[PDB]
Design a protein around this nucleic acid. Structure first.
Lengths: 112, 50, 100, 91, 77
RNA sequence: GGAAUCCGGUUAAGAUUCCGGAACCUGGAUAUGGAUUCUUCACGGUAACGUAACUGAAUGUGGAGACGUCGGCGCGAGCCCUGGGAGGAGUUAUCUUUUCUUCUUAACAGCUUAUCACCCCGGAAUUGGUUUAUCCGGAGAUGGGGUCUUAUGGCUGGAAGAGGCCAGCACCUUUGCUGGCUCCGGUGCGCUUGUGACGGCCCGUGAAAAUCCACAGGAAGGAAUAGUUUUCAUGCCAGGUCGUACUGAUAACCGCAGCAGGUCUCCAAGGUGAACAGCCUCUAGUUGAUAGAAUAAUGUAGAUAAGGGAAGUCGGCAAAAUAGAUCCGUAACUUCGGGAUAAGGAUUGGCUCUAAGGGUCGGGUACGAUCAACUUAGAACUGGUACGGACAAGGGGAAUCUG
């Protein structure tokens, strides 16, 4: 039943002014200000959160090493291993169809 | 106010020093007609209007 | 699970000053300790001995140091020995009676 | 059980608004809150999100359409007009 | 604010030329059911972090304070 | 919107600002170690992906910043409630293993930890899984095995040396000194709050930018008698300016004032009770408002009245009556949704019992031990027929005009 105060001069319950009540080693309650939560990075194609990437507030991605923000693949922390997978299927089959589309016109110019 | 600019804190700093009576040696001077501080301010009698 | 507890009382200091006797105090614990909520059901599971100057309960039933202090503060209120005799723990489960 | 006789979804409006006005709302609020068949994956997952926007749950394709139904009666015959007019070009 | 678990990695820490000081903190604890035992904490203060080595075997504690460098300003308790 | 700080102590008045300890960020130089390299710019995993690192300019793409409201559910934090134990204080005519209280752990860091999501094996109708809420599965379910996000929690470091509660000695003193103990649980439609997966709603779909990162690209620089790397570890330096006291209102603001007015917000204990209602208490804070003596009339505020019951009055104005919950019973009319708490009745305390509603554990390929809830129904007894015993708390109906 130990009531608590804000610690900064913003007295309003805004998004930037969240409070978690914690017990100190002095045996009293004191509020501590909690930052706003990090979202996960999302895939550039499907929009789903892509795994293996740490979820930090955006300037905290400059303090962590490369292996927290990537996976080991082409399009690592940008696309999501299933949009990458369909990208290789789609790149292969259309460019193979373009090889068909070249020579299928080379019979029409040979027989007109 | 309780979180101010320096241009507001400068004007209270001056008006704090003007919150005093006459120096009492003034009244002993030759041909001195100043009897009392006629520009004395108090915080609950006249607001500064900044 | 079965393990015995020992709660020792130091009644030395008032018996060398005449206000107090330990024999009736040792008697008072016997006919007032409640084992399963009933006085008189002690039956060797809780024993009260009296070394002349050191009262000692050896307990296997539920018997706390809070209850030894409560039964002692109840005893000194009956015999008007409060405002002279306090009940003080000097260690864990080793207690002491203060004069003055 | 059968909870209301004829008001259906529009029983949320209660006794207000005039019965013929709550009948025209009931014609369209059934249509805009119903699930429609996806053209692409063949599943019944297409729900409206906003007026004229119809998103499918799985395969996630969002198709533009009518404000309360997916395909309006006007735009269906349009699609078959332009279907007819295009095959007069390739023929 | 960081525990060191390798005792030989703790010994290379003391000669890292910023560690001017250390301390040896003794805590009276019990060995998980009964009797008390002596745990000791070897805290060296680096230039940006404090490293802690907890030693439960009080014999192995004795062979470690002699293994400290003679220049370290060891603060017992 | 946003780089990054916490605990403990200190003042006559300051503190996330001082002091002690312990961190993090930004900018900057930089040295050593680790890593890479004779296959020059790392390897492992089928894969999701892993990690102490593991070059990458122009330009391009993408993500974060970056987002509504309501409802119920799950989880966490703090608080409340409670058990044993270790201290202290109160009560003690009689009773009470009793009443109250201390039992605490910050930022930061290492390991571990999850709903969702994804991967591999397999290939499902006798359809299966599954939510409080019915959605998912050959576009690959159930199942077996895994990968990740680290909100969150656990352990360890920070850290017991601090803070707390006690005891024993000291003394015109600055004021001391020395001991202990600071422990293990339990519960939940609890309260506040954060959060997650969802669901409802919209002709309403609920900001922007700074800033940060990644990817693509491969310009370019690159070792073998020796280089490459500073998104890995440790090391070194600095971080300016301005505000920081106090009130925040029945006395610090605005109302000519020390004016019953007005003035944005955070925290939020116990009981009764559905309740952040009323009524009473704990912590904290006040005990301020010209007083003394009498108790005329008339006031103002609060009440009560025999018999009658609106006869008063422009008019039931004012007051009274009703009222919570449970069970029964509900009309005309209706736009079929309502009307409707219609109207109208009955019950209600205390005590002692009965019955029903649950959790977890061991069955080779029928049950039993145990633990923990307040909800509902019924029975006996009992009393100056009382029981929503204070508080709180609908008067109702038949119509007309009108929107």
């Amino acid at each position: 039943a130990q009531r608590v105060t804000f610690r900064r001069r913003n007295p309003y319950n805004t998004r930037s002014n969240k409070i978690k009540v914690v017990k100190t080693p002095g045996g009293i309650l004191r509020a501590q200000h909690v930052k706003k939560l990090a979202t996960r990075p999302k895939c550039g194609d499907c929009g789903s959160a892509l795994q293996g990437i740490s979820t930090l507030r955006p300037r905290q991605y400059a303090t962590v090493s490369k292996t927290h923000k990537t996976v080991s693949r082409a399009y690592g922390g940008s696309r999501c291993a299933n949009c990458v997978k369909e990208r290789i299927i789609r790149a292969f089959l259309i460019e193979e169809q373009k090889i068909v589309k070249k020579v299928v016109k080379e019979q029409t110019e040979a027989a007109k | 106010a309780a979180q101010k600019s320096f241009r507001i804190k400068q004007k209270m700093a001056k008006a704090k020093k003007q919150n005093r009576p006459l120096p009492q040696w003034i009244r002993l001077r030759t041909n001195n007609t100043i009897r009392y501080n006629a520009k004395r301010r108090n915080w609950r009698r006249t607001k500064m209007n900044i | 699970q079965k393990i015995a507890k020992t709660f020792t009382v130091d009644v030395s200091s008032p018996t060398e000053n005449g206000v107090f006797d330990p024999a009736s105090y040792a008697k008072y614990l016997i006919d007032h300790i409640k084992v399963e909520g009933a006085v008189g059901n002690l039956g060797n599971a809780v024993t009260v001995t009296e070394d002349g100057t050191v009262v000692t309960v050896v307990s296997t039933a539920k018997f706390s140091g809070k209850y030894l202090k409560y039964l002692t503060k109840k005893y000194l209120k009956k015999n008007q020995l409060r405002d002279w005799i306090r009940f003080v723990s000097t260690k864990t489960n080793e207690y002491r009676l203060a004069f003055y | 059980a059968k909870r209301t006789k004829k008001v259906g979804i529009t029983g949320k409006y209660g006794v207000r608004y005039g019965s013929s006005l709550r009948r025209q709302v009931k014609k369209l609020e059934i249509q805009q809150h119903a699930r429609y068949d996806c053209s692409f994956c063949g599943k019944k997952t297409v729900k409206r999100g906003a007026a004229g926007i119809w998103t499918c749950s799985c395969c996630k394709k969002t198709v533009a359409g009518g404000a309360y139904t997916v395909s309006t009666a006007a735009a269906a015959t349009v699609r078959s007009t332009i279907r007819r007019l295009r095959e007069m070009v390739e023929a | 604010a960081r525990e060191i678990t390798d005792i030989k990695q703790f010994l290379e820490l003391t000669r890292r030329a910023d560690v001017k000081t250390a301390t040896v903190k003794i805590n009276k604890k019990l060995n998980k059911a009964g009797k008390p035992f002596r745990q000791t904490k070897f805290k060296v203060r680096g230039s940006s972090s404090l490293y802690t080595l907890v030693i439960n075997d009080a014999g192995k504690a004795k062979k470690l304070i002699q293994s400290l460098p003679p220049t370290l300003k060891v603060n017992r308790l």
